[PDB]
Amino acid sequence: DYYLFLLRHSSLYDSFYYSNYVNAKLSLWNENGKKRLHKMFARMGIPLSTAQETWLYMDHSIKRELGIIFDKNLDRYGLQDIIRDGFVRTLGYRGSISASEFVEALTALLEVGNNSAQKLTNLRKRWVSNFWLSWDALDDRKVELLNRGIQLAQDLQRAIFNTGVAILEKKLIKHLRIYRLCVLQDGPDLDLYRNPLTLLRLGNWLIECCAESEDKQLLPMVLASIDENTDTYLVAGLTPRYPRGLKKPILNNFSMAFQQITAETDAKVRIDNFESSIIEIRREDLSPFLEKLTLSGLL
Amino acid sequence: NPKSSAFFESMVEDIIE
Amino acid sequence: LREELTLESLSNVKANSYSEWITQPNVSRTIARELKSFLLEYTDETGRSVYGARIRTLGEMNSESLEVNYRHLAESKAILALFLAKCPEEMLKIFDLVAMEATELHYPDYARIHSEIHVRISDFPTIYSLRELRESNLSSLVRVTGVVTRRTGVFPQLKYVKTVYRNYQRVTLQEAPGTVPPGRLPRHREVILLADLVDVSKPGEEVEVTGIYKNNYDGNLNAKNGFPVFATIIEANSIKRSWTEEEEREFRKISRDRGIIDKIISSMAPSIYGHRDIKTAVACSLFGGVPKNVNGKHSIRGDINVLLLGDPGTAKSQILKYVEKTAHRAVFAALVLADKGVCLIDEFDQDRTSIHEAMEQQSISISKAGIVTTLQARCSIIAAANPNGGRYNSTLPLAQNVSLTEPILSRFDILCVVRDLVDEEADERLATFVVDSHVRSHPELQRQRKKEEEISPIPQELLMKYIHYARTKIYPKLHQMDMDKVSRVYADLRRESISTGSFPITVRHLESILRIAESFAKMRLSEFVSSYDLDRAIKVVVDSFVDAQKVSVRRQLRRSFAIYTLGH
Ligand SMILES: Nc1ncnc2c1ncn2[C@@H]1O[C@H](COP(=O)(O)OP(=O)(O)NP(=O)(O)O)[C@@H](O)[C@H]1O
């Protein structure tokens, strides 16, 4: 199994192109990165028009030779970490799936399955129905629902990538001394980041990019997104992490920080989430809260 | 061969960059 | 067999002919070794081996044709260039088999991507028209230029005589009209295009071709002429016909300056004096608006259509010629060829009927003998006309002066009338400008620079690049604050129109106002429409609407509309 985004569905080319690790290793947000991928497939001996075919229908010979082709070629691109072992399950004649693909389907169903207090209530109630839309997909009798989950997973990753490139190309990351700050004031559709899970996926994209872009300055990161209906920013506090191939674990400190500023502050804020690393605050109060936060020694 | 080194350098820059 | 020749040993052709010397095994092996040694070793002055950099990009695009410049091959190992010019059909076989070795040195197992690579020659240093070809040119490499008159469909062709195929297509090439001598008809030739070169060119393009000149027996020619006369053909080897950050920064620099709209209009049609409103309308049509659609019952075009009523000799045909050279794609008189471009009409029942359908739709549909098919128009129309005989009559409304149906005047965004008015000072200004331009054009670098900068306030190369950039990049939108005022002005104009008994203003005019405001925003690279854009659009449309009316109605309109046509 390969750390490639949904290999056995969509295509081999899409598997590399949307992989969260490959983007950090080859810088796919710009053309000098994309050309590296074209160059790789040309050297590997795979015709680029077949790499884009649906992986079920891709030719049998390439399918069985792929396991050796990677051993000869990933080293030249510094990309050897793609290779690993994992668990695969199959039932009758309906074809294989790995656990890594299964959890992405589940997560996708969680995210996208189908004055202020009432709207909050309605939103929170909608998110609970997706629990059962996920629950019922754990049954082998209901593979039909699992396929829908996979179709949603692909669109979610597409929309995430199309926001990440905008953040990096417009250089919206602000490099403060103690931590890195990023705030989304507008977007193609900013509603997708109103759910915690989706926000976390975007954060996970940016963290791999920041982890590989320079050897220096492993820093905490803060990410926020506005909502036009509440006029509140949804805020998340994110750790750094060490690269895949490299020894105590680090600890998320935002909890105490957020808690202390909340206990002190004039600001209109909310803390009710199980994960304390996630908070909400009104439009005008974001800047004084972040000012008091950066003035604090708790970071 | 030294004269053809520029060719192989252009090939090796794919490894480097 | 084992021993090889030196390059100096090839200086003497030892057999009775070139082809019978190239085809010998020791000579051929020597040529192969030398070509490979050139391709692995040639450099820029900066080192930076170009062919190692081209083979690299061959795989990056999954391509099939390697391109070699003839001047490089003539700059060292000159004898190989001479042999290539004399015997291309042999030399290129050897060169192709060397190019595959060089590409596999970068990309092993590239044979699984494509089985065979073709070398394309460029910059061959001598040129013929279709006059100078003679029998001595047979089987020699030649370089030729002309216009592509006719093109066949693409077909597969059997490669070997287990089976394999390749693509095939034939093109007819004709002498360009500027090259043909006076009082003579143009000549023709026919070109064969193979695997990688099919659909490289379109009918009516002006094209440049390198290839082998070749001949064969034909029974019908011999039968009709009564002499042993062979037929000839050209087998093509290669065929020939964006911006940087610096350009973007320069565009943004000039757009940040005040009055850029006025400067763009001033740069429009430099050779023609006066007629600023016509230049304004033409600029607006060339930039255009944004198309929109609402699947709930409505759609709005981005194109802007303009009609100009011209007195005899008031510069109409010259500005159409100017637009034809300025614009990116266009048709002059066929609407398929005008797709996403500008269409030009300089004079004027089935033609009008076609235009009726074209103005109502944005796409054309037709059926014939039970067949059904569709085509796209998607274009801006600029038209001009002569007002129902020798002279326009200002005492009458527009309909009396034209041969058009009423919906035509409804659906044109902008209407304007141009007249040869009498004024001694204007006549003197025109005459001085005309003789000055006449002297400045006389056949008898610094002179050109002075001439250019006196001609226009913007260099027109930058203006054409700017228009293309703005059209491809900029997509403006309205601001919701001032639209209440626009609705009030619309209602006021309608009330005033009814009050004087005028033909009423309509939703088409309001749509045109918004579209013209978008175009004005696009002209300065602004993604927002602004109040001054709406003001200018309102002035243009209101003045155009006023010009269509009878004289008494015109006076009442301008007396009331003063707070729109002049004030705001
Ligand atoms: N600034 C100018 N103003 C008016 N006429 C000009 C100007 N400069 C040149 N001309 C000449 O005047 C004519 C411009 O009008 P134009 O419409 O091109 O002529 P025309 O086509 O023969 N008249 P028409 O057949 O009714 O369109 C041409 O003969 C030009 O050479």
Ligand SMILES: [Mg+2]
């Ligand atoms: Mg004319």
